Symmetry: D2
Subunit: 358 residues, 4 copies
Amino acid sequence: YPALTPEQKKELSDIAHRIVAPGKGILAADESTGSIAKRLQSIGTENTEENRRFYRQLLLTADDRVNPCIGGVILFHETLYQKADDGRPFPQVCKSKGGVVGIKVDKGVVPLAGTNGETTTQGLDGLSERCAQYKKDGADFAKWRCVLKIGEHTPSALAIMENANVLARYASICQQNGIVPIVEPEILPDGDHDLKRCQYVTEKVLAAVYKALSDHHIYLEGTLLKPNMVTPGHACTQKFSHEEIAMATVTALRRTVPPAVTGITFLSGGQSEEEASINLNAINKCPLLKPWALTFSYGRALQASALKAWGGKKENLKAAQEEYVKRALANSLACQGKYTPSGQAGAAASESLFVSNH
Amino acid sequence: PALTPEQKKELSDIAHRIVAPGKGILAADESTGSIAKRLQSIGTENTEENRRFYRQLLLTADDRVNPCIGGVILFHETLYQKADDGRPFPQVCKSKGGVVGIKVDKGVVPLAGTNGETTTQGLDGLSERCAQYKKDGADFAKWRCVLKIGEHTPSALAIMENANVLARYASICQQNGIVPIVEPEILPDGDHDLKRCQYVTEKVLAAVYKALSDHHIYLEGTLLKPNMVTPGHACTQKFSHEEIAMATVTALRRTVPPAVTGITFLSGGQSEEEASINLNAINKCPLLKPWALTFSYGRALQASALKAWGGKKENLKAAQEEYVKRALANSLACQGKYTPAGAAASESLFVSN
Amino acid sequence: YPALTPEQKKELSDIAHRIVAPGKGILAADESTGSIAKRLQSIGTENTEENRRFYRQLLLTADDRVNPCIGGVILFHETLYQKADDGRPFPQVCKSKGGVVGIKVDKGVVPLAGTNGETTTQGLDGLSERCAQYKKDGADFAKWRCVLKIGEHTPSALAIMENANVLARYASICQQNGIVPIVEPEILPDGDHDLKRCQYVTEKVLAAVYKALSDHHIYLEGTLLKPNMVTPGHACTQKFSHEEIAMATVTALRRTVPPAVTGITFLSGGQSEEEASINLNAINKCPLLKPWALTFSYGRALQASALKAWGGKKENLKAAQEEYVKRALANSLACQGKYTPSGQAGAAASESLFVSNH
Amino acid sequence: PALTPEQKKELSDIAHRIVAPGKGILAADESTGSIAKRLQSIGTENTEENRRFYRQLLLTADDRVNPCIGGVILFHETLYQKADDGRPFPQVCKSKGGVVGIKVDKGVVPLAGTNGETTTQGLDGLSERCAQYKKDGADFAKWRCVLKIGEHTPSALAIMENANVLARYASICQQNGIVPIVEPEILPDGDHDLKRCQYVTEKVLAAVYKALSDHHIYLEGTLLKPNMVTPGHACTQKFSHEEIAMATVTALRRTVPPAVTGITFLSGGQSEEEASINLNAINKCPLLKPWALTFSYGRALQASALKAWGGKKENLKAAQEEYVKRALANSLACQGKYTPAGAAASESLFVSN
């Protein structure tokens, strides 16, 4: 009793290969209303639908040097149904620039009773109809975020299992309706744990995930994974090289991610714009065999400069846009192993972008 | 700890209230699409008022029903509806000693990759919903998963995913002061015999209790709502009420911890009278049974009422006495004291899919 | 495809009901050579086969007031094939006194790699042939001991799973060959954990166990369980009532042990002879509904007085024997809720019998 | 940590030695009861010396074989036997660049309650055994589990128990410096087609790698020994070497982490020459294959040798050249360079049960 036909598997797989084609990566512009608000407050802008439309507009209409950098773009539900100044729907703006459109489908984390503050994610109710709809409207891929935490007795067995299940239900429903699912089991960087602990935990999580995906009969060639890199915790006193991070990371992946997975688009998760690209580059230079695309799905770490440059003010449109492009180019070269820093890393692009997920 | 001693005690208290001796539950929680087929069968139109009137028929029946019905399961719409005399429907229920329950699942959905098997959806925002339902009078809740015996079903994915959504559902409920009725339904569809049902029943309950343990569920503040253990609907071999009873009671002895407060069976398709008869054979089994074994019946309390009502206001009393006799027969069946039918009380209620 | 026939299930079940018939319990005389040696050294006796035969002989031939107290007796492989002074095989000595003979089949704990000193147990190789043999030779039940520890990150998921599996393989093999298995998942009392932690851990373990037994198609009515009571740890500073121990214990069992289990024969595990009987009594007096026999499978806690009285010396035969009988009578009344202490608890019967399982 | 950086490196080193480019393994580890049926087929008696002589035939073949054979799997008895010239058999092996392996399982045992399915036993005292075997020259080890495709098989219990004994086995091995070859055999018995094998193959490997993760196995210091993915022996539909290849290589892309150092296929019943041909189609698949794909063959390196030997000392050279050509053909097959049979090299080696 198969889930998918031969044609359904070719579609899903083509979609997944176009998004991580060599040199390309993912821009994640999928912050919810309550989330993007904390971004605009920090540059003194009212969080209006129109400033939301305007800022998204700024990223999706940057010049055509980004086109070979940006293979996909993840939008929030609001944005998917907004239009640029010239009247073209944002879906079509990204399509016309060579990027697959994607849509955030989860509905946020909820607490797991009887745990030390662990969560699962909700969002499956009516998901198959939402996906068919999003597909009509231009979305060819989906995103769902699960959050785990390294700490005192966490991630617990219950939270590794439950998170991995639900990422399996979500992916089954997307594939049925035409959409590549991005499976994001993010392990947070909060805490003082060292690098090898984040490797261990990540290896335990991604194995639970790819068992669950197998149990749910998910078509891996039409999926992508967006995990965290293996890093020491935010508060870890000890210091680790960028090549130590590339070794821990590639090794965690080689021990768990089956080669049929079409690619791995890392989240930046609190890394500065520059640390994200240096560590992504270091990973793509690791000489160990890596049979999947290793690129980016960066939200904060592609937009920090652009957002401080824009400041809220219409007349910085082109100066914001350019900081973003400069980043899309950095990370396209990083996702190929060709990124050598200019030595001039902007203050905004050196600022830690971490926020305790308390 | 998932819960405090005070929260745990409030759940043990409710669960015990529902399934007190000689009491069972009225499962009146038909969705608006499935109460449509019960009304279509009696020529009545599917209108908000005709559902309101039918539900008021069942809730306002006479006080003989009060010791029979510890809990009434209601659909959303009916929770916010009122009797003719102005009272909201939950206050009618409480006024007669019934605890009010709320069905909170959002139905089945296909599971890709299986032969026609499903999950159950409904978890999104369930915490806020329960919080509110508890403020509006509801103290227990209901969630149905649905498995079917076929050549390759219930599969491992099916059993494991439905036990996991049940447990999630139950965990949310209990954090909001709501007693969860856990409902893993094995449907009677197909030609399997009794042993097969028994094997599947055991296999599904073992998976259910394990999942509930993993999710830290307080079992004293749960009810279990399982199918009886019966042959398939299309089975040619036949079996006595004593065989059904033995096998149902065996299967639950081997899988259900004594801490679970009550077992409230679904009727599943059985005639009003076979459901009562079987429930009585179960309770008369000499084996030891550490939990209440009672009824949470929809069709097997409602089929004669609906026919006797006919959509006609003048039939209210007649149709209300039909409910009250099946409520009274099950009150005795769930104490082993029912020693009895009529055509409507002997008609198969089996529907497919 | 069933594992057992109707007759095979009646045999196994009858055997299991005869062993915990009201008022009866289990004497565990199944210490290995290396283990019983540490017992005899502590009364200054050479650990010879003949002193081993003699001491076992002392317990199995005590007067016939023990017969209604002792429903089964677990022997080690050596003992099963020894003979009393009058030439009668020990199996037959216990049979003639009304007790089922039982045999220890495990081969001791081994380390689980990558854990903090956790173990599983080994002993399955050739087990089905050993069981058929033991059955010919008089054994109607078997014992296998799994050990878990409460501590820093233990019992771990791996050790709960693996232990529970292997207890499932062992029980499948016993039933096939005619023998009731006693499933012993002992959680050690070592450590300073409080009572509610031992409840929690015990509830998690016994649920893993009875899932595994279900997965392996084990016939529960022809099984018994020998768990630890729920107690605070040995080093726990805090103090707990005997009724608090009976509440934690009965509650842990009601939440996990399906009613079809024929009985629960507690291990004494470091409790004094007297604490074991008071806590067993308190448990059988707990007014909560308990649908299984709640009796004893005591090794150390039936033999401490007898062994210090015997001292190694043939002429204390009858004085040793009597301390043991006095204990079998205590615990038969306890397993009925009828044990009220004499106030005169012997020093040997008040001595802690704990030994760090380091 | 299960292991130190130094222990891990010694395991990565051995695993890589075995499956170096153009090298595969000689699976010469027949138990004394199963080498009895290979000898009975050539009229030879089953005596300690006749097994010693046959094993010496295969081990002392000429140096052309040295670049083909990175590892030789031996049965206990043969590990302590000697060549005519006095050398112990492992030193013969090492002298020609072969790593010596030891089969350490104690066979299959029925799993109650299933349709004829088995586990594998052999864990008791395995740590001491390995410790000693490593002292006597062995650096890898072998353990075979056996699953069969049938209407209700491989069941969930079967898949889960055999993945768990494999992992235990592998954990013990690695604590003693021994590279474990993990062998989950899906037998070719039955009439299933290729898709079925593929589905089952994927399902079993996903369970294997999960179990290995749970038990903390260092995958760089393991080898995987899986069946190719082929139709059932009694399947009427037929399939090309390209289809077999695609499907085998797909199934392993979807389940085997790139960290596993090598995949050493079992022949499973295929003729000496079909096994070679298939291995070559696998390695020529243009898809990406992050691990070595090579051979650990018993019958598909030994069938022509045994026939040409006939039990007759004078046939030694003839029978040794038969081994050396299949060793040489597979050395090329596992590089995609085999472009070729004979009756004995084309005969089905399928046996039942």
